[PDB]
Amino acid sequence: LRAEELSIQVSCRIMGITLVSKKANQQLNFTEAKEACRLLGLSLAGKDQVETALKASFETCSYGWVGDGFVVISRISPNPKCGKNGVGVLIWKVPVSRQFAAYCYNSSDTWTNSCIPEI
Ligand SMILES: *[C@@H]1O[C@H](CO)[C@@H](O)[C@H](O)[C@H]1NC(C)=O
Ligand SMILES: *[C@@H]1O[C@H](CO)[C@@H](O)[C@H](O)[C@H]1NC(C)=O
Ligand SMILES: *[C@@H]1O[C@H](CO)[C@@H](O)[C@H](O)[C@H]1NC(C)=O
Numbered sequence: 001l002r003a004e005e006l007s008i009q010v011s012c013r014i015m016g017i018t019l020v021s022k023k024a025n026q027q028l029n030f031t032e033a034k035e036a037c038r039l040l041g042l043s044l045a046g047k048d049q050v051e052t053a054l055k056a057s058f059e060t061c062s063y064g065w066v067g068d069g070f071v072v073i074s075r076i077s078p079n080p081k082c083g084k085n086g087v088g089v090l091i092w093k094v095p096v097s098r099q100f101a102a103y104c105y106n107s108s109d110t111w112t113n114s115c116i117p118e119i
Contacts, residue, residue: 001032003039012115013106014058017045021062021101033065033102042104043067049105050074051089056112063092064101071100 010018020036022028028036037044044067050058054074061082063071070093073083083090094100111118 001028001035001039006036006039008040009062009101010058010060012113013109014056014113015049015053016106016109016114017050017053017058018042018104018106019060019062019064019101020104021064027099028065028102029099030065030069030096033100034067036102037104040104042106045103045105047072047089047091050103054089060101062101064103066103069096070094071098072103 005023007021007023008018009021034044044065047066047068050066050072057076058074059076060074061079063073066072070091072089072091074089075083075087078085078087
């Protein structure tokens with residue numbers, strides 16, 4: 001996996017969280033998801049860290065790997081095409097060979113929204 005084949009799909013990180021995917025037609029298996037975050041200087045987020053981001057209204061319509069070894073989606077408002085209309089951080093247990101996006105975590109972030117200065 002090469003860094004140049006990655007897409008960063010959240011520029012304003014919410015509680016340290018971004019979503020990373022691959023510019024190509026295949027996405028990231030579990031090993032590749034960890035590598036994608038590592039190449040960016042980030043760790044693969046845990047589900048608990050995505051829940052913390054959801055509390056700050058982080059939302060996606062992509063399943064992505066977390067370090068717990070399954071994929072999650074972060075939902076604020078129900079949509080039938082995103083986590084089967086659920087809200088929450090929803091878990092889908094898939095083979096580690098299955099390709100999805102990756103949730104990466106940036107521990108250096110100290111603001112709730114990295115685009116919004118806070119005291
Ligand atoms: C984070 O900040 C950006 C920049 O204003 C904004 O567009 C985005 O909606 C914010 N996200 C959240 C979850 O507050
Ligand atoms: C994940 O993909 C890589 C190719 O980048 C491959 O070497 C590895 O075996 C794959 N892992 C699984 C569990 O299939
Ligand atoms: C994490 O976010 C900070 C800003 O809070 C940024 O300066 C830094 O580059 C990010 N992490 C990495 C590995 O770049």
